Amino acid sequence: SNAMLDVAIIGGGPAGLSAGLYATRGGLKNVVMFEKGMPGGQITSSSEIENYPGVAQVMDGISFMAPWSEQCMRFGLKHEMVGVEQILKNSDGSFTIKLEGGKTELAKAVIVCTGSAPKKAGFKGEDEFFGKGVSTCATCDGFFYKNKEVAVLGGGDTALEEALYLANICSKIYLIHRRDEFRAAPSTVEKVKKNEKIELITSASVDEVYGDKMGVAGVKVKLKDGSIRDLNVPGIFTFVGLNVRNEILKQDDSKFLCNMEEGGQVSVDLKMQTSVAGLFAAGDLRKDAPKQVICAAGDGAVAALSAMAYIESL
Amino acid sequence: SNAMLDVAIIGGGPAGLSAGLYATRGGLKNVVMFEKGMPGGQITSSSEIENYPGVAQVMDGISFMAPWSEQCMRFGLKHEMVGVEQILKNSDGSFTIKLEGGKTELAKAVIVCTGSAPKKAGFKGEDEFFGKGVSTCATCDGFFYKNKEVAVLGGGDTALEEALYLANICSKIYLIHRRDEFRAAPSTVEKVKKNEKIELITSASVDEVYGDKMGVAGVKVKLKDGSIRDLNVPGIFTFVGLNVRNEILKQDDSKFLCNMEEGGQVSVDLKMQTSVAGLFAAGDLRKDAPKQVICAAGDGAVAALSAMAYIESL
Ligand SMILES: Cc1cc2nc3c(=O)[nH]c(=O)nc-3n(C[C@H](O)[C@H](O)[C@H](O)COP(=O)(O)OP(=O)(O)OC[C@H]3O[C@@H](n4cnc5c(N)ncnc54)[C@H](O)[C@@H]3O)c2cc1C
Ligand SMILES: Cc1cc2nc3c(=O)[nH]c(=O)nc-3n(C[C@H](O)[C@H](O)[C@H](O)COP(=O)(O)OP(=O)(O)OC[C@H]3O[C@@H](n4cnc5c(N)ncnc54)[C@H](O)[C@@H]3O)c2cc1C
């Protein structure tokens, strides 16, 4: 803060944490990871991760991520709990980091790690009921729906997993998806087809969620034949994908700071180098991201290794 | 073996194991990981890994890798304990995998994961004494040098780490490196400068290791001023880097199966796609590899995700 940072890391999920670990273990002394909440990012809202190689114990996202803070902070990494609004490239080659509330930081290098956020499904009442029966986090809100029926929308690994989790809590789940077959791991699909508490509604979509100020009262589902089915349920959870959070790269002339991809990803090469010297990107934000925890970690380590070499070069 | 494989994975280190985990969890049913020894690969010979994010317990390479086999084999991954000699691309788009002893396998897709092997340092007697006092594995051979003096050659994280490990076993270590400063994590360097049992010989190199059929008897070191120092020691361990194992991509006309990099790496894009359809590469073998365990795991998951999409496409 008094002196210019070596690296500013924007986001504290697996990619940020991992970049912070590598940059500081590696020898850089002023490394701040700006994460608006607590670190962990997206996965902390999952009920089950099991595919992170080298971690053989199946557990929830919060338990999975808990040890990371201590580990990734052993060599001096700092966590500032603030939101970042904008990255700028200075005429001199340094970076300016704009923070919420009008504060500013300077940095030789920047690794943008800001992750992704839940896509809109696109149905009537989605926005109007968000936080009053419409949700994108089952671990946060499950408890409110104990011994109650809810809907879950989506057909990927995430939807099914959170449907299994909600099946231990709610009396019943309607799992709704627009295709006849799920795009998801077969062992998860088998557990879902075998769970007496989950009813599949396939080749279907959500027409409307309705209710009033007190909350959601129900969901209208459009079935394969074009008919409507009225689900009398106080909650629906949506898991239809996520968009990249790339707001902070947008300049005041509405252009992006570096080369972007068609779908909003930041363009990078294998070393996570963007088109702008000293700006790196890792995790879901980078080009062609597979959207996995192990991969966001790999990327973060690459970025830090490239941010170190770049710093040694000047 | 009776039917064509979905994926053949060549190598079982972190990258292979991780690719096998992803490909099988993902739904592919015939996936063989060909690993000539036991899985784990290079890191199993390290005395300490601590920087694999999400694993907060510091431990040796064998303990680190032990849980992986069970985890990465939960969805049907097969381990064939055989060496692979050659990859071929069939006129029809399938792959032929040539094994040691004249056996053959077929596969829709191939992920080459074969890792790297210890570079030669380039000194007189290096080859002549290999396995009779010259070594590249301190955990394998340390025990033979209990209460004895040895030399360690190299100046990276690996050399220093194995020098710390050998310092609990041997009476003394001479750490030799060609530069005045080590290219390594500062916390490791500090532990090395603080260890009463390790003597640094900087700006130096090895002129000759000598001895006879009974083994190494000593090392001649060339010092910064051009003079020779005779280290009377029965062992020297070298850690001067590694080369990629890319032998199996070489065809009979001596050309490589796909586009290669100047330093022997296999050219890939972000999705670990090589120039040849259905051939992927991950870990140290791929272009610009950072040479880290977390990264080889990330890559392996990417490759498997790309091998799945490719397979669904045909
Ligand atoms: C429900 C669910 C289940 C999943 N299950 C699995 C699984 O089983 N296996 C698997 O591999 N993957 C799974 N994933 C994917 C995995 O969670 C993501 O790939 C991964 O976390 C992406 O990591 P990241 O570090 O790139 O970004 P993120 O996880 O999003 O980390 C980004 C962090 O940056 C912070 N941030 C963003 N913008 C700013 C800013 N402006 N200022 C300050 N802070 C900011 C955010 O608050 C967030 O905490 C799952 C994802 C979800 C949603
Ligand atoms: C001493 C040492 C210490 C290290 N310490 C760290 C550390 O602290 N942190 C870190 O991140 N990284 C460390 N590394 C680096 C890390 O070990 C490598 O980056 C990583 O293991 C590369 O993984 P890979 O899966 O690409 O290849 P590998 O680890 O080499 O795995 C390849 C496997 O493929 C098998 N194989 C190869 N060719 C064939 C074939 N023809 N047929 C059948 N099988 C074959 C081999 O037997 C080998 O087991 C260290 C490396 C060494 C040598």
Side-chain angles (χ1 to χ4, degrees):
Chain A
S1 181
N2 270 353
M4 176 161 48
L5 313 188
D6 296 312
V7 186
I9 298 172
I10 319 301
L17 282 162
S18 174
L21 180 48
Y22 267 72
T24 63
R25 198 185 184 259
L28 294 179
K29 299 289 168 176
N30 216 336
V31 180
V32 174
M33 176 189 75
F34 296 83
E35 162 65 66
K36 176 158 194 166
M38 283 307 292
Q42 275 173 63
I43 193 71
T44 55
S45 82
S46 178
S47 60
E48 189 180 82
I49 179 156
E50 61 172 12
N51 60 350
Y52 184 93
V55 177
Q57 194 209 130
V58 169
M59 50 182 126
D60 69 291
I62 292 160
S63 296
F64 181 79
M65 285 306 302
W68 293 51
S69 299
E70 178 281 322
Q71 182 193 2
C72 296
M73 284 171 84
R74 274 180 209 160
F75 314 86
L77 177 59
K78 299 310 169 147
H79 186 205
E80 273 319 310
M81 216 171 333
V82 65
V84 164
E85 305 213 290
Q86 203 176 32
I87 310 305
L88 299 175
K89 172 89 169 158
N90 304 316
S91 50
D92 86 336
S94 69
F95 291 85
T96 289
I97 319 281
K98 287 187 80 71
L99 307 169
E100 77 182 344
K103 302 259 185 194
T104 307
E105 208 66 93
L106 267 84
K108 292 169 195 214
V110 176
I111 311 169
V112 199
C113 272
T114 45
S116 291
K119 223 149 189 135
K120 291 296 161 164
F123 52 79
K124 193 180 162 217
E126 190 169 20
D127 287 320
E128 157 184 31
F129 286 101
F130 185 80
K132 315 178 176 39
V134 168
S135 182
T136 56
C137 189
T139 55
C140 298
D141 295 331
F143 79 89
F144 180 87
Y145 295 102
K146 164 148 156 201
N147 312 140
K148 289 181 186 291
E149 322 199 333
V150 297
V152 166
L153 176 52
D157 284 291
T158 298
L160 277 50
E161 284 156 7
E162 302 306 291
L164 289 168
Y165 164 89
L166 286 167
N168 294 319
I169 296 167
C170 311
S171 58
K172 175 148 159 175
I173 312 289
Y174 309 93
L175 180 54
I176 299 164
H177 172 55
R178 35 188 321 287
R179 320 217 172 83
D180 244 30
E181 246 218 299
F182 293 110
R183 253 39 144 222
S187 64
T188 299
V189 177
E190 298 317 310
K191 292 183 235 202
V192 168
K193 287 157 107 128
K194 263 158 188 169
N195 190 309
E196 61 293 307
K197 284 167 104 208
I198 306 178
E199 186 193 330
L200 280 32
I201 310 172
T202 63
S203 301
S205 53
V206 171
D207 216 33
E208 169 179 20
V209 61
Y210 62 89
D212 55 28
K213 98 189 97 62
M214 291 324 289
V216 168
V219 183
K220 307 279 192 200
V221 188
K222 194 149 64 57
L223 273 26
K224 168 179 197 175
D225 36 290
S227 65
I228 315 288
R229 180 179 173 181
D230 182 351
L231 293 180
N232 176 26
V233 287
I236 173 159
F237 291 84
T238 64
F239 298 106
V240 294
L242 319 101
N243 292 322
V244 299
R245 281 187 280 244
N246 67 17
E247 297 64 35
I248 75 185
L249 297 162
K250 238 248 207 175
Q251 309 296 271
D252 302 341
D253 50 31
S254 280
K255 192 214 163 213
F256 283 95
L257 192 70
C258 59
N259 290 343
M260 314 291 302
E261 296 293 309
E262 243 288 291
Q265 290 79 15
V266 164
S267 309
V268 305
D269 53 8
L270 292 172
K271 313 183 191 266
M272 292 307 117
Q273 264 159 201
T274 73
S275 49
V276 165
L279 178 68
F280 310 81
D284 296 344
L285 184 74
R286 62 83 164 181
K287 188 177 188 239
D288 283 338
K291 289 170 263 238
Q292 308 286 319
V293 175
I294 182 78
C295 295
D299 285 358
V302 168
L305 295 154
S306 299
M308 289 157 59
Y310 171 76
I311 276 164
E312 293 307 302
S313 94
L314 43 66
Chain B
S1 181
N2 270 353
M4 176 161 48
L5 313 188
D6 296 312
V7 186
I9 298 172
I10 319 301
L17 282 162
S18 174
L21 180 48
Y22 267 72
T24 63
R25 198 185 184 259
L28 294 179
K29 299 289 168 176
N30 216 336
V31 180
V32 174
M33 176 189 75
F34 296 83
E35 162 65 66
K36 176 158 194 166
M38 283 307 292
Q42 275 173 63
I43 193 71
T44 55
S45 82
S46 178
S47 60
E48 189 180 82
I49 179 156
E50 61 172 12
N51 60 350
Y52 184 93
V55 177
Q57 194 209 130
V58 169
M59 50 182 126
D60 69 291
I62 292 160
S63 296
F64 181 79
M65 285 306 302
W68 293 51
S69 299
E70 178 281 322
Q71 182 193 2
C72 296
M73 284 171 84
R74 274 180 209 160
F75 314 86
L77 177 59
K78 299 310 169 147
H79 186 205
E80 273 319 310
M81 216 171 333
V82 65
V84 164
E85 305 213 290
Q86 203 176 32
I87 310 305
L88 299 175
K89 172 89 169 158
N90 304 316
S91 50
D92 86 336
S94 69
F95 291 85
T96 289
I97 319 281
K98 287 187 80 71
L99 307 169
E100 77 182 344
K103 302 259 185 194
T104 307
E105 208 66 93
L106 267 84
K108 292 169 195 214
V110 176
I111 311 169
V112 199
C113 272
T114 45
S116 291
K119 223 149 189 135
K120 291 296 161 164
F123 52 79
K124 193 180 162 217
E126 190 169 20
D127 287 320
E128 157 184 31
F129 286 101
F130 185 80
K132 315 178 176 39
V134 168
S135 182
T136 56
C137 189
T139 55
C140 298
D141 295 331
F143 79 89
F144 180 87
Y145 295 102
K146 164 148 156 201
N147 312 140
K148 289 181 186 291
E149 322 199 333
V150 297
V152 166
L153 176 52
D157 284 291
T158 298
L160 277 50
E161 284 156 7
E162 302 306 291
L164 289 168
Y165 164 89
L166 286 167
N168 294 319
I169 296 167
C170 311
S171 58
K172 175 148 159 175
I173 312 289
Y174 309 93
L175 180 54
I176 299 164
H177 172 55
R178 35 188 321 287
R179 320 217 172 83
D180 244 30
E181 246 218 299
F182 293 110
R183 253 39 144 222
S187 64
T188 299
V189 177
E190 298 317 310
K191 292 183 235 202
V192 168
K193 287 157 107 128
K194 263 158 188 169
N195 190 309
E196 61 293 307
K197 284 167 104 208
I198 306 178
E199 186 193 330
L200 280 32
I201 310 172
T202 63
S203 301
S205 53
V206 171
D207 216 33
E208 169 179 20
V209 61
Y210 62 89
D212 55 28
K213 98 189 97 62
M214 291 324 289
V216 168
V219 183
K220 307 279 192 200
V221 188
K222 194 149 64 57
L223 273 26
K224 168 179 197 175
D225 36 290
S227 65
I228 315 288
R229 180 179 173 181
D230 182 351
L231 293 180
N232 176 26
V233 287
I236 173 159
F237 291 84
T238 64
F239 298 106
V240 294
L242 319 101
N243 292 322
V244 299
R245 281 187 280 244
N246 67 17
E247 297 64 35
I248 75 185
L249 297 162
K250 238 248 207 175
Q251 309 296 271
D252 302 341
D253 50 31
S254 280
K255 192 214 163 213
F256 283 95
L257 192 70
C258 59
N259 290 343
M260 314 291 302
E261 296 293 309
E262 243 288 291
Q265 290 79 15
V266 164
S267 309
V268 305
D269 53 8
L270 292 172
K271 313 183 191 266
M272 292 307 117
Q273 264 159 201
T274 73
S275 49
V276 165
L279 178 68
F280 310 81
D284 296 344
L285 184 74
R286 62 83 164 181
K287 188 177 188 239
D288 283 338
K291 289 170 263 238
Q292 308 286 319
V293 175
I294 182 78
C295 295
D299 285 358
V302 168
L305 295 154
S306 299
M308 289 157 59
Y310 171 76
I311 276 164
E312 293 307 302
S313 94
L314 43 66

